[PDB]
């Protein structure tokens, strides 16, 4: 909508209180100015059309139960946003300040969130097994990169491919979730999962198999379920992008972590010059360690820790 810029204040759904960039026209909207062609946030009303409508508000403030949602979808998109332009000098989704999207309260009780190859969707949970997804930064983050994902390497959601698509999702969530550093981890997803017990996530990346993930070539997944395991298998890659920022011996194989910035430099250079739709492992592998070498050089220690990483997980 055409209006001006204006700056409400919410709060989250952890009950933190923070500023969102909004738009005055009558009443104010989710709709935020200062990113690119706009970051616009709707509500799906607990129905299942999309995008439902720009969310207006009548003051400014949002610290209802039913704005939670909205405030974090709004704001970490936002922050998403700041990390790919900061950081990788990308602008939104596209590259070209692409309108950045998302829906809360959608359907009813719906224990899930995705990109629907135009905009982030968010559901509120049924309460036990999740409490509304936008919650977790690592999650808005997450989905994003399937628009950033769509847009460069294109990896088909299947199989091998579909795996890489996953972990890089996982592994920019969590690079998106250090940026902003609040109680960052490798976990994916605790923010959001079931309230009512602590300290577990939907999928480690430290530890794939504290969920049944494979943390090893040898465990893959391969049959039919989850487009063939797409977020079983991304567990062999976590772990390989875990070992190259923070290192660690992994069935007696030792990698010499390079932290965090490096581990996006690499896996971000990758994503954007060298995979590809059908990209497998193997591909992913060598488009790591040329990303690495262009980086930083062919004997670097970059590329050194790129490869022990994937020999770790049994990814030649
Ligand atoms: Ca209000
Ligand atoms: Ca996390
Ligand atoms: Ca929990
Ligand atoms: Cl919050
Ligand atoms: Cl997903
Ligand atoms: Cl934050
Ligand atoms: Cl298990
Ligand atoms: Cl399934
Ligand atoms: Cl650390
Ligand atoms: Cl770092
Ligand atoms: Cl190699
Ligand atoms: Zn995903």
């Given at each position: ?23 005055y ?22 129905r ?37 332009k ?106 959001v ?62 990698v ?6 490096k ?16 990209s ?37």
């Open positions: 909508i055409t209006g001006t810029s204006t700056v409400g204040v919410g709060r989250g759904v952890l009950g933190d209180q923070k500023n969102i960039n909004t738009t026209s009558t009443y104010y909207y989710l709709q935020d100015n200062t990113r690119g062609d706009g970051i616009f946030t709707y509500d799906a009303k607990y299942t059309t999309l995008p439902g409508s720009l969310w207006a508000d009548a003051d400014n403030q949002f610290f209802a139960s039913y704005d939670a949602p909205a405030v974090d979808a709004h704001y970490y998109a936002g922050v998403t946003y700041d990390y790919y900061n950081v990788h000098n990308r602008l939104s989704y596209d590259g070209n300040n692409a309108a950045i999207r998302s829906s809360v309260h959608y359907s009813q009780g719906y224990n899930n969130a995705f990109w629907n190859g135009s905009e982030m969707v968010y559901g509120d949970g049924d309460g036990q097994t999740f409490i509304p997804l936008s919650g977790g930064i690592d999650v808005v983050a997450h989905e994003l990169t399937h628009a950033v994902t769509d847009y460069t390497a294109g990896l088909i959601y299947q199989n091998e491919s579909g795996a890489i698509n996953e972990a890089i999702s996982d592994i920019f969530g969590t690079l998106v979730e250090f940026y902003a550093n609040k109680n960052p981890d490798w976990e994916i997803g605790e923010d999962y079931t309230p009512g017990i602590s300290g577990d996530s939907l999928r480690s990346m430290s530890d794939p198999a504290k969920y049944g993930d494979p943390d090893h070539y040898s465990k893959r997944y391969t049959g039919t379920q989850d487009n063939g395991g797409v977020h079983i298998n991304s567990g062999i890659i976590n772990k390989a992008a875990y070992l190259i920022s923070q290192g660690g011996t992994h069935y007696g194989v030792s010499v972590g390079i932290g965090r910035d581990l996006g430099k690499i896996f971000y250079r990758a994503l954007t010059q060298y995979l590809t739709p059908t497998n492992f193997s591909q992913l592998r060598a488009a790591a360690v040329q990303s690495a070498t262009d980086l930083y050089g062919s004997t670097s220690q970059e590329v050194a820790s790129v490869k022990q990483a994937f020999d770790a997980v049994g990814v030649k």
